[PDB]
């Protein structure tokens, strides 16, 4: 889907397999966090289905012993001063010494500020001990979390459930067309892109000689010249688009290890899975009731959230016994209005706009001339796009194709995809929802200077789910967007005593970094909110509490109370409503039983299981159940009669006997049992069909074939 899911598919520990456990018969003690996982396996990232606890992710600093055990680095402390030697330990040794906590107050000389410290004992128990018998310390915080989890700002303010949800949802975002970098984030974005391998990195220092949209030619310092080719609009494994764009000029000088070209979800070397949007937190007319989201119409006009999806089709040229199937443009007796695109070989041309039902490659079959039938590849229902490229493999050119086939054709179709109702959005803190409405720009709440907001979130889901990292991210995002400058005329204020230099002033659209377990304390945020640069006019839109005065787009009257406004990072998940809508009135039927097929690739019906039958029997509806179970599903003579009755406008006839009952009777007889259906007075009923009217009325295919003229 994106580089992060690829980097996380490896570095993955599975408990299932040959010689391991069973998915259903696992238990409840093997799905638990053991006190020996600190630093070796992440306790947050795991599936939330029936695989919970049986799959995990390796930590960041961990490494594997030659024997097969996992080690972590610890920094050795001698005689109360924290040294700088690093030693790798396994759980066996780790459960023997006393190991301190990651964020202890070292006093720039190695001695602890406070005598009491939290440590972990032999049995994994935590306790408060005087700082005299410790002999190890953690190398850094974030050493207990995985690589997907270390990319959440303000992680310590979120409960375990929502943190797990956000870490799992970060791997489903699709690559957009622009992919701008986050305004507020952690420092793990840069190393998660280079190591995944989606970007081009120069191997040796030199001066770039030539730049284009396809290749980059680099002239080294010893006369050697190296040219890098780039992949443009290539299909991924899941249908998304993989692209690479240069980010260097024609005279710049590069260095060994510098990023030269971007990738799918990369911006200037950093991972960028979403967009920055202006957010107000308030209920609004019930359109965001129960986790729904309200969007603006500017995100549709300006292609803020738009993605390219590519699909592939294929055909085979077989050697049928009665002849040999061939690819040609002589489809039996078809109007030439449909052969307009197929040039001469029967293969569609590049750039044509296809629709549902059209022809991609024309093929014929020998019936056993006067035997040519039409079996050509056609676009299935619900597809469109522009043909991007055709790849043809032939037997007469040494190409190794399997015996029986002699010509392969592969046609790629691509389409752009905008945002709409039903598409799923999510954030990094566990918020997720579908889009309930898209409003015009002219009727969204707007600030004092007339800037509309971009997305409205409800306020009833924030406190009872215990994920308040989003409001803090909102405040810090607004502060980073508008900039700040601390007035340090008389010394430095008390609350900014710990802030480093270069962080007391920031220009608009700055980018800041908040590591996972040591970042901006709440006092610093409260202080920064009170000193923010004004807009182009001498105005401040957001006061000291993080709230603003909004007008109403429909009535014009200002809202009576101020509302929380900020900037939030929103990503577009890969659950699109364009691939989830299905309907069917009549289609293909199965073979052993005459029930309708199942699935979406073929026209498939919806299952009506046991629980729905129980509900219908509780309602007392006896005719609806009988009509659902006989004429709509299985009664082979009743279906055509019902269709004729509906078309002619007459009454629906009576049902018959489903074929599954007869199949069951045949099985029971074949198991050497004597099953009989009797009448009121013996005389077992024959139950052996009868002479019906074979004349196919209405002269129409029931629907197994759509329509051939």
């Amino acid at each position: 889907n994106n580089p992060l899911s690829g980097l996380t598919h490896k570095r993955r520990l599975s408990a299932l397999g040959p010689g391991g456990l069973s998915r259903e018969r696992a238990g409840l003690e093997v799905r638990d966090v053991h006190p020996s996982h600190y630093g070796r396996m992440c306790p947050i990232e795991t599936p939330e289905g029936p695989n919970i606890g049986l799959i995990g992710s390796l930590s960041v600093y961990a490494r594997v012993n030659p024997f097969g055990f996992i080690e972590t680095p610890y920094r050795k402390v001698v005689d109360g001063v924290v040294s700088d030697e690093i030693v790798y330990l396994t759980a066996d040794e780790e459960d023997r010494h006393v190991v301190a906590q990651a964020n202890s107050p070292i006093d720039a000389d190695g001695r602890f500020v406070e005598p009491r410290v939290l440590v972990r004992r032999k049995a994994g128990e935590v306790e408060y001990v005087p700082s005299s018998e410790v002999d190890y310390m953690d190398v850094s915080p974030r050493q207990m979390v995985s690589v997907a989890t270390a990319m959440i700002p303000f992680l310590e303010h979120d409960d375990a459930n929502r943190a797990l949800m956000g870490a799992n949802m970060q791997r489903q975002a699709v690559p957009l067309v622009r992919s701008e970098a986050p305004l507020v984030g952690t420092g793990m974005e840069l190393r998660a892109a280079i190591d995944a391998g989606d970007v081009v990195v120069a191997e040796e220092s030199g001066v770039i000689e030539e730049v284009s949209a396809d290749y980059i030619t680099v002239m080294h310092d010893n006369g050697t010249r190296r040219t890098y080719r780039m992949r443009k609009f290539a299909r991924s494994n899941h249908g998304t688009c993989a692209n690479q764009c240069p980010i260097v000029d024609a005279g710049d000088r590069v260095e060994a290890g510098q990023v030269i070209a971007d990738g799918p979800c990369t911006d200037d070397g950093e991972m960028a899975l979403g967009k920055n949007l202006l957010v107000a937190i308030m209920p609004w007319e019930g359109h965001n009731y129960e986790d729904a989201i309200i969007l603006s119409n500017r995100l549709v006009e300006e292609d803020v959230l738009t993605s390219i999806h590519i699909e592939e089709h294929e055909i085979d040229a077989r050697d049928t016994k009665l002849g040999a199937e061939e690819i040609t443009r002589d489809i039996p007796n078809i109007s030439d209005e449909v052969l307009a695109d197929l040039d001469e070989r029967g293969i569609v041309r590049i750039g044509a706009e296809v629709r549902d039902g059209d022809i991609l490659v024309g093929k014929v079959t020998p019936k056993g001339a006067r035997e040519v039938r039409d079996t050509s590849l056609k676009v299935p229902h619900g597809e469109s796009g522009k043909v991007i490229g055709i790849r043809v493999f032939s037997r007469e050119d040494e190409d190794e194709l399997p015996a029986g086939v002699n010509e392969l054709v592969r046609v790629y179709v691509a389409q752009k995809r905008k945002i709409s109702d039903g598409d799923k959005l999510a954030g990094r803190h566990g918020n997720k929802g579908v889009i309930g409405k898209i409003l015009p720009v002219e009727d969204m709440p707007f600030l004092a200077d007339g800037t509309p907001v971009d997305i409205i979130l409800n306020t009833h889901g924030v406190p009872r789910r215990m994920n308040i990292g989003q409001i803090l991210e909102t405040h810090l995002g607004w502060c980073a967007h508008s900039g700040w400058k601390v007035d340090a005329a008389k010394g430095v204020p008390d609350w900014a005593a710990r802030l480093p230099d270069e962080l007391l002033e920031a220009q608009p659209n700055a980018i800041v970094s908040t590591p996972v377990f040591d970042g901006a304390q709440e006092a610093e945020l409260q202080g920064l909110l009170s000193c923010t640069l004004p807009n182009r006019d001498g105005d401040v839109l957001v006061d000291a509490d993080g709230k603003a005065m909004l007008f109403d787009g429909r009535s014009g009257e200002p809202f009576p109370y101020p509302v929380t406004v900020g900037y939030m990072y929103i990503m577009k998940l890969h659950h699109l409503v364009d691939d989830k809508i299905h309907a069917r009135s009549t289609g293909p039927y199965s073979m052993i039983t005459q029930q309708p097929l199942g699935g979406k690739a073929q026209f498939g019906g919806q299952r009506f299981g046991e629980m729905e039958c129980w509900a219908m029997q509780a309602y007392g509806a006896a005719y609806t159940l009988q009509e659902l179970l006989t004429i709509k599903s299985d009664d082979t003579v009743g279906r055509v009669k019902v269709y004729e009755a509906i078309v002619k406008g007459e009454n629906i006839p009576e049902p018959g006997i489903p074929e599954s009952f007869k199949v069951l009777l045949k099985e029971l007889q074949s198991l050497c049992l004597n099953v009989e259906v009797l009448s009121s007075d013996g005389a077992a009923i024959e139950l052996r069909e009868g002479e019906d009217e074979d004349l196919e009325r209405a002269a129409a295919n029931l629907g197994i074939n759509l329509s051939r003229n």
């Binding site: 190398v139 280079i194 260095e255 290890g257 510098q258 950093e270 962080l503 800041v512 908040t514 610093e524």
Partner: peptide, 21 residues
């Protein structure tokens, strides 16, 4: 740092890391 052309992103962190990823 330690990346020849990384974009500048100032951090709020107070601790010092002795070991790199």
């Amino acid at each position: 740092n330690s990346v020849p052309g990384a974009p500048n992103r100032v951090s709020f962190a107070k601790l010092r890391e002795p070991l790199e990823v």
